[PDB]
């Protein structure tokens, strides 16, 4: 697990053979990560939309460990102010909001 | 309630006499709402920072009902793509992430 929200919900993740930190972001649809090198196929995706769009590489069905939980989901790879775990992956780990 | 994340976590809020919809956003520090006309004193606050800053009006200790929970917190009033309930108010309603 239960994470309170007095601080930013930053967790450790393992992806593409690297240990990283990422923000559990219920306001984000998708997961976006920077400085990762993933194997396999990708397609460009445009995200954002305020001020213009940002193009990223969309990798589908990426194995990723989020806070001890080995899951699979789409990871967008490109420049991001900070690494974001979006709802697409929070569903996979069985993460809910509770009050 | 327990809110799963397959959809955007949009909830009903009562604020300044009005009923509104807003997103439970754990990636947001602060709560930003548009088209509300709150009573009492305020100070300008600069938020965002990517591409420039956005100036909003910061109201402190605002009575607000979020999904049936009557709480008190800081509300920033200004133009926002989506009304956002940030961590500042999610702490007040006792909202946690769980997996």
């Amino acid at each position: 697990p239960q994470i309170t929200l007095w601080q930013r919900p930053i967790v450790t993740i393992k992806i593409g053979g690297q240990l990283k930190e990422a923000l559990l972001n219920t306001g984000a649809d998708d997961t976006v990560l920077e400085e990762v090198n993933l194997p396999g196929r990708w397609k460009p995706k445009l995200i954002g939309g305020i001020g213009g769009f940002v193009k990223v590489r969309q990798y589908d069905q990426v194995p990723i460990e989020i806070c001890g939980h080995k899951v699979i989901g789409t990871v967008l790879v490109g420049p991001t102010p900070t690494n974001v775990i979006g709802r697409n992956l929070m569903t996979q780990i069985g993460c809910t909001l509770n009050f | 309630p327990q809110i799963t994340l397959w959809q955007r976590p949009i909830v009903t809020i009562k604020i300044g006499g009005q009923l509104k919809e807003a997103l439970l956003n754990t990636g947001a520090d602060d709560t930003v709402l548009e088209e509300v006309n709150l009573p009492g004193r305020w100070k300008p606050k600069l938020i965002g920072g990517i591409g420039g800053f956005v100036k909003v009006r910061q109201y402190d200790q605002v009575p607000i009902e979020i999904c049936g929970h009557k709480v008190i917190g800081t509300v920033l009033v200004g133009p926002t793509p989506t009304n956002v309930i940030g961590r500042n108010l999610m702490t007040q309603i006792g909202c946690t992430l769980n997996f």
């Binding site: 649809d29 | 956003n25 990636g27 947001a28």
Partner: peptide, 7 residues
């Protein structure tokens, strides 16, 4: 700061 994302 504040962190959503559409799409």
């Amino acid at each position: 700061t504040i962190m959503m994302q559409r799409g």
